[PDB]
Amino acid sequence: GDKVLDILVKKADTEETANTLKNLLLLFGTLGMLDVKQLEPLILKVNAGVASAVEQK
Amino acid sequence: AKAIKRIQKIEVTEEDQRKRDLREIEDALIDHKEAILETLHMLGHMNERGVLPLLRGLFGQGDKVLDILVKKADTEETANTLKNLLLLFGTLGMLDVKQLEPLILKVNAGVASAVEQK
Amino acid sequence: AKAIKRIQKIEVTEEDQRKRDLREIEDALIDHKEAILETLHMLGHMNERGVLPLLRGLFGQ
Amino acid sequence: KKTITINGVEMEASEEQTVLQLLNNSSIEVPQVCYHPSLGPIETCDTCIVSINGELKRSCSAELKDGDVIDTLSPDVKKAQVIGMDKILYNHELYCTVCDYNNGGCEIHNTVKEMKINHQSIPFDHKPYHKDESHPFYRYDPDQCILCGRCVEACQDVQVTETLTIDWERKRPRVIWDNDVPINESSCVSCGHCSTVCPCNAMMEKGMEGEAGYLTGINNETLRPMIEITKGVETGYGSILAISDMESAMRDERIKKTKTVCTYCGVGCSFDVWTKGRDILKVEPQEEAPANGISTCVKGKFGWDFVNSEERLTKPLIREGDHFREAEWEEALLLIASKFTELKEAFGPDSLAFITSSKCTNEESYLMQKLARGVIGTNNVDNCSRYCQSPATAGLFRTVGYGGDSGSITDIAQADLVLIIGSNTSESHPVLSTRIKRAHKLRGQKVIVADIRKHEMAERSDLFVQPRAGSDIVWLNAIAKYLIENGKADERFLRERVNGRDEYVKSLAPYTLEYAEEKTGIDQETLIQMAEMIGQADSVCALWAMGVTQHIGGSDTSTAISNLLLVTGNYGKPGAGSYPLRGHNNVQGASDFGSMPDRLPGYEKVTDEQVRQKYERVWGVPLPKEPGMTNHEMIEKIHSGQLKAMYVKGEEMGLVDSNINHVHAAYEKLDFFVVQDIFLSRTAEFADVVLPASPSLEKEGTFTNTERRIQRLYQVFEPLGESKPDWQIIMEVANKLGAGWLYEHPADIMEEAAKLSPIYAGVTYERLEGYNSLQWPVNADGKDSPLLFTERFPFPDGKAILYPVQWTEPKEFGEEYDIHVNNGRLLEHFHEGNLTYKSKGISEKTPEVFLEISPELAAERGIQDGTLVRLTSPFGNVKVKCLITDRVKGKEVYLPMNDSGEAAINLLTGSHADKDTDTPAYKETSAKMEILKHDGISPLPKINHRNGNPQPQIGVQVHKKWARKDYIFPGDAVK
Amino acid sequence: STVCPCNAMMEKGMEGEAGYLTGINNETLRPMIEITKGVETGYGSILAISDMESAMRDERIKKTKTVCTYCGVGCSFDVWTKGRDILKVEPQEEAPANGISTCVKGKFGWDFVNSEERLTKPLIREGDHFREAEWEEALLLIASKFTELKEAFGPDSLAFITSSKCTNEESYLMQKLARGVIGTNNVDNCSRYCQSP
Numbered sequence A: 001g002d003k004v005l006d007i008l009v010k011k012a013d014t015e016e017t018a019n020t021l022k023n024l025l026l027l028f029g030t031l032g033m034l035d036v037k038q039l040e041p042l043i044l045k046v047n048a049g050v051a052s053a054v055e056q057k
Numbered sequence B: 001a002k003a004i005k006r007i008q009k010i011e012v013t014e015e016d017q018r019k020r021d022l023r024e025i026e027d028a029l030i031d032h033k034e035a036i037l038e039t040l041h042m043l044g045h046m047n048e049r050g051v052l053p054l055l056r057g058l059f060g061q062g063d064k065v066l067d068i069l070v071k072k073a074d075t076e077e078t079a080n081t082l083k084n085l086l087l088l089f090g091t092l093g094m095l096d097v098k099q100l101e102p103l104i105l106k107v108n109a110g111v112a113s114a115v116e117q118k
Numbered sequence C: 001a002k003a004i005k006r007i008q009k010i011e012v013t014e015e016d017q018r019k020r021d022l023r024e025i026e027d028a029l030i031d032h033k034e035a036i037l038e039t040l041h042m043l044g045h046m047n048e049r050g051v052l053p054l055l056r057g058l059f060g061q
Numbered sequence D: 001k002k003t004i005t006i007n008g009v010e011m012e013a014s015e016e017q018t019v020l021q022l023l024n025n026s027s028i029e030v031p032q033v034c035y036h037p038s039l040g041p042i043e044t045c046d047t048c049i050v051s052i053n054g055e056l057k058r059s060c061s062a063e064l065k066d067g068d069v070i071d072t073l074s075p076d077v078k079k080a081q082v083i084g085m086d087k088i089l090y091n092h093e094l095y096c097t098v099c100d101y102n103n104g105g106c107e108i109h110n111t112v113k114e115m116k117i118n119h120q121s122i123p124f125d126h127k128p129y130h131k132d133e134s135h136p137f138y139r140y141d142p143d144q145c146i147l148c149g150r151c152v153e154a155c156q157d158v159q160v161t162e163t164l165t166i167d168w169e170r171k172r173p174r175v176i177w178d179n180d181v182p183i184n185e186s187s188c189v190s191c192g193h194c195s196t197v198c199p200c201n202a203m204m205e206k207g208m209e210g211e212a213g214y215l216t217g218i219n220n221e222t223l224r225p226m227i228e229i230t231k232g233v234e235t236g237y238g239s240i241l242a243i244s245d246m247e248s249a250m251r252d253e254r255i256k257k258t259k260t261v262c263t264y265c266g267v268g269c270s271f272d273v274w275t276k277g278r279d280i281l282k283v284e285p286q287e288e289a290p291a292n293g294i295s296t297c298v299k300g301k302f303g304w305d306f307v308n309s310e311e312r313l314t315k316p317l318i319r320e321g322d323h324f325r326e327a328e329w330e331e332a333l334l335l336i337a338s339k340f341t342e343l344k345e346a347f348g349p350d351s352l353a354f355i356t357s358s359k360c361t362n363e364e365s366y367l368m369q370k371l372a373r374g375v376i377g378t379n380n381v382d383n384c385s386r387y388c389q390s391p392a393t394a395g396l397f398r399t400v401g402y403g404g405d406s407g408s409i410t411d412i413a414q415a416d417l418v419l420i421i422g423s424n425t426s427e428s429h430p431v432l433s434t435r436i437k438r439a440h441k442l443r444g445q446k447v448i449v450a451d452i453r454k455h456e457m458a459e460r461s462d463l464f465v466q467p468r469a470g471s472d473i474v475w476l477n478a479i480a481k482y483l484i485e486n487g488k489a490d491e492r493f494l495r496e497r498v499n500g501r502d503e504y505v506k507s508l509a510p511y512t513l514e515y516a517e518e519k520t521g522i523d524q525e526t527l528i529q530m531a532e533m534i535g536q537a538d539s540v541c542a543l544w545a546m547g548v549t550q551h552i553g554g555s556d557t558s559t560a561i562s563n564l565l566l567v568t569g570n571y572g573k574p575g576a577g578s579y580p581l582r583g584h585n586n587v588q589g590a591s592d593f594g595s596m597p598d599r600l601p602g603y604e605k606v607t608d609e610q611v612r613q614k615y616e617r618v619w620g621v622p623l624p625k626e627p628g629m630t631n632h633e634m635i636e637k638i639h640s641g642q643l644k645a646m647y648v649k650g651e652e653m654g655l656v657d658s659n660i661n662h663v664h665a666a667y668e669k670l671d672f673f674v675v676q677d678i679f680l681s682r683t684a685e686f687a688d689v690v691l692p693a694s695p696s697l698e699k700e701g702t703f704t705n706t707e708r709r710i711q712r713l714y715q716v717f718e719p720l721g722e723s724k725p726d727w728q729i730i731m732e733v734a735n736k737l738g739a740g741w742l743y744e745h746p747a748d749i750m751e752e753a754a755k756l757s758p759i760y761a762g763v764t765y766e767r768l769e770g771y772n773s774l775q776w777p778v779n780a781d782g783k784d785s786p787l788l789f790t791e792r793f794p795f796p797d798g799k800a801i802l803y804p805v806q807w808t809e810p811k812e813f814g815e816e817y818d819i820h821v822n823n824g825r826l827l828e829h830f831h832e833g834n835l836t837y838k839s840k841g842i843s844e845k846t847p848e849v850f851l852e853i854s855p856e857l858a859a860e861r862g863i864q865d866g867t868l869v870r871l872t873s874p875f876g877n878v879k880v881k882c883l884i885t886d887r888v889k890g891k892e893v894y895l896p897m898n899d900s901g902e903a904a905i906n907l908l909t910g911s912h913a914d915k916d917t918d919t920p921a922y923k924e925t926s927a928k929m930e931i932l933k934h935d936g937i938s939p940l941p942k943i944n945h946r947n948g949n950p951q952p953q954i955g956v957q958v959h960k961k962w963a964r965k966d967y968i969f970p971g972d973a974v975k
Numbered sequence E: 001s002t003v004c005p006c007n008a009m010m011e012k013g014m015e016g017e018a019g020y021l022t023g024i025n026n027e028t029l030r031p032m033i034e035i036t037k038g039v040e041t042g043y044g045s046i047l048a049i050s051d052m053e054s055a056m057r058d059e060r061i062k063k064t065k066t067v068c069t070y071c072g073v074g075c076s077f078d079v080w081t082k083g084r085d086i087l088k089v090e091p092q093e094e095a096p097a098n099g100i101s102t103c104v105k106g107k108f109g110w111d112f113v114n115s116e117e118r119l120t121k122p123l124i125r126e127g128d129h130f131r132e133a134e135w136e137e138a139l140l141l142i143a144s145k146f147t148e149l150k151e152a153f154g155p156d157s158l159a160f161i162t163s164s165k166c167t168n169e170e171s172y173l174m175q176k177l178a179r180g181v182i183g184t185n186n187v188d189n190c191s192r193y194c195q196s197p
């Protein structure tokens, strides 16, 4: 297990992976900040609009 | 021989039945000797690695862990975040995606055309 | 000594083989004494915390 | 020949008639949902659409004409198949993950996976009909019914019970029993063809229901919402189909599928027994099964609850004082061994007599006879064959020389005429009767049923004639005389492979057609027309069960039948010959391995120096020169004090032998009695020590069915409790008797007997793996003989001999014994029912014995239904309920053996037996008719299969479906 | 097999037995390989996963140095095992006598160790057979017999042979038992037939 953890950290320690995890957490936080109660009518309207768009043959 | 129907079942007491069933369990252990050895090694390696002690701290001071979790989470920001995540899941469920597959294909083609411009 | 090839394997009955394998399992337990203690403590702390009773309600009903 | 082109590639044609067979042999992935190899083209699923000659047509019924063009990957044929399967799935909910039939063999699932479909154009629509759980064995789910018609085709054409039709005229077509009668109330034999042939879980056994897999035991009130959830969640069928394949792999671990052969009757049908631990979930026949294929009866496919019955004897029982003490295995073994040594070294081995069960494997009977001869030194061995097949085998020796059937059941179907005499093949050997009825309804074969009763086959026979009790010999020999006198007999065959034609004709001098008309009480026209039919028929298959062989002259009329075929010239011809219906699953096998006292294993007489020397060399113990006494005469010898000890295994001879008062007196008279039965049978009640047998499911062996087929079994279960397979018990007993037997598994016993038995010379366990079966005689190379007498007869000259026999007078009591009661067996129940009664479903179908009484005799004697009546014979006195039916005629009445109490018929029969083989004349019984209770409960419930009215139609009658306006053919739907 | 960089030329002992995910059947391993080929975009992450799988192997794979028993070259190599079976005989560049050099015997001849014919228990000549006797009773029997023939006809009538196939400690123990225990000098090996001249 020590070797497994060592491999995991040595591969992950690249700035790209740390940035990826940080931005995933930030995306979760922002999606939490975004209010979705008002977004349900927007989703319904988007559904109707996509239906109308694909209706055009 | 005359006509006799009644059956005198042997008097297997609790001790004998317990011994028989324990012998059955021992035989089942015998069939899976290698499996039991592997599971014991599982526990040994987990305890050496601290995984088992980590869970021992998790479940021995579990009340403290839950207290820390709730006291950190109880902020309105975290409750709002979880509520909005659930709402986002519900809305994405409400959104119809069968019609959205051609839109995704068109978006793919458009992104390809856009990146095609050097 | 003359030429003899056949081997008379010792007659280890079911009882002796069972005792030997149970002794092997006991020795494996001995090697992982601390691990077994930790797992028993695992079960104890989970049951005290209600996690094990919670799963007991989950799988009984 | 008949050159073809398929998939754009040239290919050749075979004897196959339809394109579907060629595509299957070419491994072309053509969807075939409604097609089953045994059923034939049903044409009701339309998923087999292929482009023949460019036009879209059903490959299941498209004739393989020469020069046609076949294409299967074309967009047109693919679209047609997709439309057909969409129509199918419109009738199938397709909840594969939580469906019991998804054991990976479900044709809708396999075919749906094969087509790689993901959507159904027509959504599933529940039929208004509810699931029909009236039957205690299998249920029908019209919601899941896809109307493929395989079940209807099975019940109408391959089993010919004809209880299933399809109401195509209804708005929602569905399978209906009789006139839409609930299943239980209908005429459903419960044979299990519909369950076996169903593609989907529409017609599936209740044993599987809620018990097959892991997610299917969920309650319906909480399983249906999950099914609706998955219906509304998954978008493509591929992913959830893969999940269902994982669930099939799930089932594979818990579901044990082992091949076995049914124990009940001598057809020896082989099938897998799908179990989950100890309970039996399904009895699934396989197309590769030699004796039956998919064919099955109620017993072999729903009668196995006796294995898990709590009444089963798990421990040895020892007669302690006035009770049966549950003793240890070792102490019981020591007791039986010590007692046997005492009565062997005190009065000699000749006073020791042991009986093997015809229900046990070949190894079991071989071990019985070896313990008797190679250990004890006696020759007193027998089985039920003394009551069952001793006269038939004696007749075969007297004329043909080989015991057993001339061929397989396939040869029975291939016959042009079947001459069944004294056989209730519908209710005794059900699968053979299904074959015969299939050949009669479809192949056009005409059968002549000759028995006093009118069973299902008699009312479905070309010519049914009822002769007098035991008068088969008279009319039969008159028919033979007419055939040999008018030139219709095969004179070439007579000169080639027969001997003593003129001597037999001299024996036939007193026999005339009017003589037989007077004796048998049958008009001359029927006899002359059936004789003309026999002479005209190219292939003749003669079946004679206990109705004729169980008589005082049963051996004589058995020889008469065999020489009748000999005169006709059917032996050696494919598809024709003599097929004595071997009763028990291994009565043929027991007789093969020296069960009869006068013969050794290999069907060799004991009084032969060469065979005795060979058996001495192999066994190391001298063989008894004195032939053993017959089973029936054992009781008389006991009453004279000659015999003292019995070791009867798996045979309840205290209740099935004639005059069971006599066997009861002998049992109370003899000193030591050891029995070996799975259940505490009637014989097991009177025993100094009871040994716990093991059923054939829990033991491995070889069963030799009626067709002389030796099929190897498999250990379906570990034996219940610590009870042992009977071969293990016999090995232990003989070892305690200083035999020194070492047989780890019955393969060693099988190969030793194979070396000893000339007929079994080639049968070995590696040659009997899976469903492979060999038919004795088999040579050392391993090539069996599917047809007997094919090239030469076993006699030294190579030609058979006609045996001069006459009408032996039946031992009718006469005088006050006016009503001649007939004894037999029911379809659902097996003898007294030590096995079927333990199954709840068969008990529901038939709870108690009944006396079937003729309507004509119901007037003069004034008898009604549900009435307790008394039958008194100089040997017994029974109190049996009454049933009103037209199956029996006149005074003669039918009393099935399906009770083991005071109502068992075997009280009435007497100790009068055949001259040649001492076989008791069970069919020769007379009594009184005493009326006890006027009004009572009818023994036959409404849910019995005899109360229904089957609808005889040929096929699924698809043409009715095609006439529906709503139905559209996918081939022209794609257009 | 030893010099191959990749698994191109590799012993059948390793094949399907080295790791945990490599015992998967080829008919169900190849589709997984194609899945991973079509799934991962960069080799770094799946390379790290493969390093974890190497650590996986490290626990079950025992790599211990030994010297071949067959001939006198004395080639030394690691013997990669998984429990009791021998998966690979891997020579190392640091091996003094051979380095990477190996023959068929030392690198594929070690199935005799796991052979079922191997004598697991002491055998005692009982009558006309070899009875599988306990260690202690066999030891007592041999000791008592040797004391009998040592105190009856003298140690000079006792002769013992060590195997040239056994370690130095083994032959030293033979000669010590002969001289420091029995008191005799009658000792030899195959070298009398092999290397004495």
Ligand SMILES: CCCCCCCCCCCCCCCCCC(=O)OC[C@H](COP(=O)(O)OC[C@H](O)CO)OC(=O)CCCCCCCCCCCCCCC
Binding pocket: A001, A002, A004, A005, A008, B048, B049, B050, B051, B054, E049, E050, E052, E053, E056
């Ligand atoms: C298909 C695979 C499915 C797997 C499916 C696997 C499913 C099981 C879960 C595995 C991970 C458990 C949690 C491990 C982390 C939490 C515990 C921890 O932090 O414990 C510290 C310890 C430090 O060790 P030290 O010895 O230094 O310290 C010892 C003492 O702490 C001081 O004395 O951590 C270890 O030991 C590492 C344990 C294993 C981690 C594995 C991580 C990746 C798992 C997924 C990928 C697997 C791919 C396998 C295949 C390629």
Ligand SMILES: CCCCCCCCCCCCCCCCCC(=O)OC[C@H](COP(=O)(O)OC[C@H](O)CO)OC(=O)CCCCCCCCCCCCCCC
Binding pocket: B058, B059, B061, B062, B063, B065, B066, B069, C048, C049, C050, C051, C054
């Ligand atoms: C790398 C770590 C990987 C961990 C990897 C860990 C993997 C194992 C899972 C842990 C959580 C199990 C479910 C726990 C919740 C459900 C059960 C529950 O509700 O049970 C109530 C009880 C109340 O206790 P009380 O004593 O008050 O009540 C006692 C009686 O109910 C009345 O008498 O809950 C507890 O006890 C708390 C148990 C531990 C919860 C831990 C939550 C966070 C886990 C992830 C982070 C860990 C980080 C560790 C490292 C920092």
Ligand SMILES: CC(C)=CCC/C(C)=C/CC/C(C)=C/CC/C(C)=C/CC/C(C)=C/CC/C(C)=C/CC/C(C)=C/CC1=C(C)C(=O)c2ccccc2C1=O
Binding pocket: D093, D094, D095, D096, D097, D098, D215, D226, D227, D228, D230, D231, D237, D240, D241, D243, D244
């Ligand atoms: C934070 C915290 C600790 C919270 C605790 C509380 C909390 C929120 C807990 C989570 C609760 C949740 C969300 C649980 C859901 C996940 C779990 C645990 C599920 C287990 C429950 C079960 C039994 C799920 C069903 C699984 C399963 C594989 C079901 C079978 C699916 C069925 C019925 C399929 C039928 C079926 C249908 C309908 C087809 O159409 C079809 C077509 C073609 C081929 C096959 C099929 C087929 O099989």
Ligand SMILES: *SC1=C(S)[C@@H]2Nc3c(nc(N)[nH]c3=O)N[C@@H]2O[C@@H]1COP(=O)(O)OP(=O)(O)OC[C@H]1O[C@@H](n2cnc3c(=O)[nH]c(N)nc32)[C@H](O)[C@@H]1O
Binding pocket: D264, D265, D266, D299, D384, D388, D421, D422, D423, D424, D425, D427, D428, D429, D450, D451, D452, D453, D454, D455, D467, D468, D469, D470, D471, D472, D545, D546, D547, D548, D581, D582, D583, D584, D585, D587, D822, D823, D824, D825, D826, D827, D828, D829, D830, D831, D832, D923
């Ligand atoms: S043998 C035997 C055994 S073993 C086994 N028993 C059995 C079977 N099936 C079921 N469901 N339960 C069982 O207990 N099959 C096996 O049957 C074997 C004997 O069966 P039969 O076919 O001989 O069966 P029955 O006795 O029921 O039917 C015989 C018919 O013979 C006719 N019959 C009676 N007296 C007759 C006479 O004098 N002459 C003629 N020509 N026929 C006579 C009756 O019609 C009986 O139906």
Ligand SMILES: Nc1nc2c(c(=O)[nH]1)N[C@H]1C(S)=C(S)[C@@H](COP(=O)(O)OP(=O)(O)OC[C@H]3O[C@@H](n4cnc5c(=O)[nH]c(N)nc54)[C@H](O)[C@@H]3O)O[C@H]1N2
Binding pocket: D263, D357, D358, D359, D360, D384, D387, D388, D389, D546, D550, D583, D584, D649, D650, D651, D652, D653, D655, D656, D657, D658, D676, D677, D678, D679, D681, D693, D694, D695, D696, D726, D823, D824, D830, D831, D832, D833, D834, D835, D897, D905, D906, D909, D922, D923
């Ligand atoms: N009146 C009249 N009497 C008849 C007849 C008739 O037609 N009319 N027919 C006669 C004939 S042909 C026969 S077969 C007999 C029927 O009599 P038997 O051949 O004795 O048959 P059953 O009693 O059906 O079965 C005997 C016992 O075998 C046991 N058994 C089942 N499977 C096994 C197994 O695998 N191993 C062992 N060791 N035991 C097992 C069952 O518990 C059952 O009690 O009846 C005979 N008696």
Ligand SMILES: CCCCCCCCCCC(=O)O
Binding pocket: A055, A056, A057
């Ligand atoms: C003369 C110009 C004709 C333009 C037509 C544009 C498309 C009209 C129909 C849109 C649709 O329903 O697909």
Ligand SMILES: CCCCCCCCCCC(=O)O
Binding pocket: B116, B117, B118
């Ligand atoms: C004289 C103005 C020239 C404008 C060119 C704009 C870019 C044209 C090419 C676009 C591309 O393919 O990258």
Ligand code: SF4
Binding pocket: D092, D093, D094, D095, D096, D097, D099, D100, D101, D102, D103, D106, D107, D108, D109, D199, D200, D201, D202
């Ligand atoms: S009958 Fe076949 S296709 Fe239908 S749900 Fe059951 S397994 Fe699936």
Ligand code: SF4
Binding pocket: D151, D154, D155, D159, D161, D162, D163, D164, D187, D188, D189, D190, D191, D192, D193, D194, D195
């Ligand atoms: S007789 Fe009964 S079990 Fe047999 S096919 Fe007909 S309905 Fe099905």
Ligand code: SF4
Binding pocket: D140, D144, D145, D146, D147, D148, D149, D150, D151, D152, D175, D194, D197, D198, D199, D200, D201, D202, D203
């Ligand atoms: S019940 Fe009969 S017709 Fe209906 S799907 Fe099943 S086999 Fe086909």
Ligand code: SF4
Binding pocket: D262, D263, D264, D265, D266, D267, D268, D269, D292, D295, D296, D297, D298, D299, D300, D301, D429, D430, D431, D432
């Ligand atoms: S016909 Fe006879 S052998 Fe075949 S399944 Fe039914 S009872 Fe068994």
Ligand code: SF4
Binding pocket: E005, E006, E007, E008
């Ligand atoms: S370990 Fe990886 S790189 Fe080396 S041979 Fe195997 S697959 Fe190729």
Ligand code: SF4
Binding pocket: E068, E069, E070, E071, E072, E073, E074, E075, E098, E101, E102, E103, E104, E105, E106, E107
């Ligand atoms: S590896 Fe080959 S050459 Fe080297 S010591 Fe062993 S047998 Fe001799």
Ligand code: FES
Binding pocket: D031, D032, D033, D034, D035, D042, D043, D044, D045, D046, D047, D048, D058, D059, D060, D061
């Ligand atoms: S197999 Fe031909 S339509 Fe079904």
Ligand SMILES: [Mo+4]
Binding pocket: D384, D385, D387, D388, D583, D584, D587
């Ligand atoms: Mo019988």
Ligand SMILES: [S]
Binding pocket: D358, D384, D385, D388, D389, D583, D584, D587
């Ligand atoms: S029988």
